[model samples]
Target: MQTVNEMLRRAATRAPDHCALAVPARGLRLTHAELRARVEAVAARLHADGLRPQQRVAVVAPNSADVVIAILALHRLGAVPALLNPRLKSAELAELIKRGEMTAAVIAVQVADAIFQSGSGARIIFLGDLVRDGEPYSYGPPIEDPQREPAQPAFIFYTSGLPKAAIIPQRAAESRVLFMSTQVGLRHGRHNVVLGLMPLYHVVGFFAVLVAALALDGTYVVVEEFRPVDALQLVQQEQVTSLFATPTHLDALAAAAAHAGSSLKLDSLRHVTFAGATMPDAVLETVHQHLPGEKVNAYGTTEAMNSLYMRQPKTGTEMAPGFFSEVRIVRIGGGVDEIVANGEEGELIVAASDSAFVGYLNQPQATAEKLQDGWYRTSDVAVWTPEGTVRILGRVDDMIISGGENIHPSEIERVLGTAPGVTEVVVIGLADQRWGQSVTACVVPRLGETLSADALDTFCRSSELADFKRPKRYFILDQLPKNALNKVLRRQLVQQVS
Candidate 1:
């Protein structure tokens, strides 16, 4: 029953001089002791502001030192801090606040302006007001409370929400699984510095980098914005040992690293951890060439906090043993009741030593729909290989039934993504008169490059992808629509094709 504050207290006592957070823009550097003092101050402010235990306090701020202080403060006060996407539209965010029943919100100055323009009634407090000249003020002892439980909700985070109407709420676990998974990729050491480029609102940013760094008493370098050149410079200058970022971030870093010349040494970086979307084979290969270390692909979602992971093998191969948890492929025969044996491609059912989530917040129907008889239906299609490795084949929703044949969009995108001059691509199903739904691919070419319809068709014909999976039509776009977390909005692409 250890709470987040309890964990922080332990870290403070064990490693008082260790750096907890580092932000170059604000020139903020907090050791374990300073971080604890700031958390206490924020908790005191929350108590003075009339915050009750387990009440919802929404946070609408960019990634900054203040954001971490607010989160730790909420945990200390036993209040749920709902991390809102900073880029969400006013109307969209208002609906979320109402749905979550947020009583109060602490927003950054820039974000506060947006909320004011939208006329939100939620009790608003400025994040800048909480700090004195960008440094957190110390508030003496923590308030004593007997009713708080460690299993209670601490933070409320939503999924990528690329589908617009589909928003999945996830709860944080008290156990250190989040930190443990990060450790699988980046081991702990006093000198180890973890570079964080992902947005703090995302799970990877908070749990993977921030909390993991604190757990291990390691240094954390937080990048509020994604700048390839700046991130590369930081890696080299700060002597970062571990990196946790998205594939897109890694691709950008690889390009930046190459442009910096061969003399620039990045030997300090030993591990690169990626999780968000499926990493295109080409992107993975390029990252390995530029970054001198193993690339760990962590597969999971907000609902399931990293259930399965494949560590970098000594020798690159198709099959690698996964660490922690077991994955089972349950064949689906057009319904939920149907189940087939192993070796058959079907829905992914995940069973872990510790379950991913208790359930979705306030959504009983979705909770019941996803959880089944001790196995969580992941909605993803996967097949178990002879070596016991599970190969994920996109989501069941991404399946296109064309001319009585089923096609997985991920399988096609995997090939198209590697094609010459293809930088970003999304495969979706569009309605057709002859076929119920036909495969359609929308591509965004690399800068200063061009891709033609015939070129793509010829390339796919040469590849081993099934004939049915080949896109019937190709639409060239400047950029693919993505949510705040940068996940492609496939539904939006489908709507555009429709």
Candidate 2:
């Protein structure tokens, strides 16, 4: 429980011959024995190179088996990885380097030069040289000082604030996988084969997809890049039982399969988890139409992992928060707080279990804002349902006050995107001389389907939606821009549509 390495060791001992890791893109498959060997080999090297416990290393690599090995090796040695996105600008990475005060950086061979052109000052060790070098390891590798405290950080994911790193405690990361498996009824999920599309830089991918699969002794299929058609095909070829993806990922999947027939029906796919953002009702419904298993909308953050969940609503708009996580609905501003009535609107907050993040690294103020009085104020807007589910509207800042009526863009996006010819929709409010704020819908058209503002407005009006919530303006894009974590960049959307 102290380190993810301990999780690896236990799994390796229990299922030595089990397939612990597999990469279809690289033709790499490793049994537990093989995975253990690679992890130890790299750990020995890092030891020889003087990386030690409580020290930090930057794992800036693409999604691959080696990166996985790098993480296990570091955790075994009790070092923390500043899980970095390789796609960031030069100045950004440099800023991260200083922030991490990195003892060393394990750079992916592909991005070695780009990292340099962007100016990384840390001691660079190519990821290629870390493992797979065919070099013999020195006997007598330094003994590991296994992490003593569960609260000490094992991994750091940076996102969302000025001083961005959310240092995840070792207990919380492992607890997340265990808690989720029980919550999802994955019976060791012996039959579950996972689609490993979520990038490890994000906590959802790091703990849920990768850690859960390995710790539970399940089959894992990984791809280099996510091409919609390619991902869908693998669900057939690999007999994938679980999909960890964003709404956009599922949207593309539904598009690729819906219009053109695939000999593959995702019958074997059991559970569909939409993370990072709420799944639009249209997207969730479309997913259910294609698969036999249920699709649930899940919400988690880097700081607090998998705190809220709800199965597909049979007949309503709200989602019930599941076990081990408690939810509270509070009015936005105040002196003495007021808890809103069930079925009423308010800011959503969660009180989660032990594995929640300790804090933002070096950003006390930001961390304090996130966790207060044992409650992690999510800043998400929501409504408590009569059915005991919470209907997450969107982020609080994302709420649109247009022409004096409060509007949740997700409502507009869900209805409009569900319309034929519209593949995706994001609702935003822009500054206007007319109304205090103008409600606008930015859209992506479905394949071979053309849509116009007049047509979309007609569809919305024809449906049972409010007049104030309808998009006052429309803009179209081939695709929406998303970060590595795949949350839609709202600020960027405003800038683009403006």
Candidate 3:
């Protein structure tokens, strides 16, 4: 894996005047040559700020050309960029920054105001200044040799709820992006236009769409955030040929188009890819009805790094590992003697050609528990069909996928469990027609302390729990139902709590 800069450098050199970056929402566009210059300029500013190789810097900003420049600039400097969710509450943001050991933070002006208002102690580098048009800056020396790029952590993205989890080296991120690029048929290509609904903060939006577009000499129509109507308008106008989103995104787009009736003809759209949540049959049916495109369903985890996907599957649940990745369905809880036989259901495990790990940053125990030899145990139960497609049955954890975002109940429970008037908490996902599932919380209040739903919501907000993670409705219970072994029978909570 060449250093990100070198890859961009070559793409820019190979196609100096090609469209390397464009943010239509912000009216910003740059040719490869111009984009490279801006990235180098940002890298110069970072170096001038005393940021050095291997030092970690946190970047919390929305999707845009400037944000991408920040990522590339940091890569050029060999500094790890901790890409964080800009919408994180100050408390949640503070936890991640501290846990990630961010030496400094580069935040967009709007987000920085919110982050700073909460007494964030980390050194701050205002993004606006660094991205200031025509800011006095110049390029630094070339990046380190290509051989060293794969091993170095390009950026650290948290896995689930908190503790600034898992780290993906530059090579792994690029590998997944490149692999996904192929699955989307973005190869041997001429020009393609993409409506960027995915956020840079997340993997699906980052390498899967943005970085891939850059690598393939494609035009990326940035949509900072997903707004169904606006995204629909852009897709039709830009003649967007490709898209990356969760089921919710596609569902909303399809609905908006259908609502528009004859006024819209999203004829430009030809390919759609999605992951994160099960796209309910209805949603995919809707998408298929109006949009002219084939579908690709993907399944991945931050730990194993995008292990499975399938192109134009017959159903939402069935998929096959495309290539370069090994796949197995093995029985859980038994020793090594437990590989599942044909037609049997078991946990899905994945591995790379040369072998790899599922290590969490600063969490050795986690690394050991998860990184079994070379195969990463994904804990997704699946069964092999006669057709050779792997059909997902369910997840082993209580993590909920809402609107394409992975929301772990444990994280919210952590926040609510400590909130005032809360004695116990158990969070679970309930099926919803639109979102696939909605996060619901069952809280047991301390005796003599009443837990007001409004107050609890306020506490979650103050705690910086993401908006999606916040329970849409609260259910007060006297006590959590437990099994004979004292484990939470979470399934029972859905009915019992309510």
lDDT of 1 by residue, 166-185 (tens): 22222344333344544365
- Each prediction's Cα lDDT score? 0.70, 0.74, 0.71
- Give the RMSD in angstroms, all C-alphas superposed, for model 3: 10.5
Provide TM-scores for the models: 0.88, 0.86, 0.76
Model 2 misplaced regions, further than 4 Å = 109-120, 133-142, 160-163, 189-192, 228-233, 236-239, 254-262, 265-268, 312-317, 334-337, 418-425, 431-436, 442-459, 473-489, 492-498
Pairs that collide, model 2: 172-355, 319-389, 319-390, 320-389
Candidate 2 residue lDDT tens string, 1-498: 535677667778878887777676666788877888878877777887778787888888778777888888887777888888867654566667666677778877335554455455667887777765223244446565564587787888877633388788877866678655655655473566888888888887888888888777776676668998888778887778887787778888877778647576667887777762556556666776665466766776777777766566442245656666777898875311478877778888777457688887777888787787777778888887676767777788888888777788877877886788887788888988347789989899988877788988889889879777878889978888775444678888898777
Clashing pairs in 1: none
The full ranking of all candidates by TM-score, starting with the best, is 1, 2, 3
lDDT of model number 2: 0.74
lDDT of 1: 0.70
Can you list the residue pairs that collide in candidate 3? none
Q: State each model's C-alpha RMSD to the native.
A: 3.5, 3.6, 10.5
**Whose lDDT is higher: candidate 2's or candidate 3's?**
2
Deviation (Å) of 387 in candidate 3 = 2.4
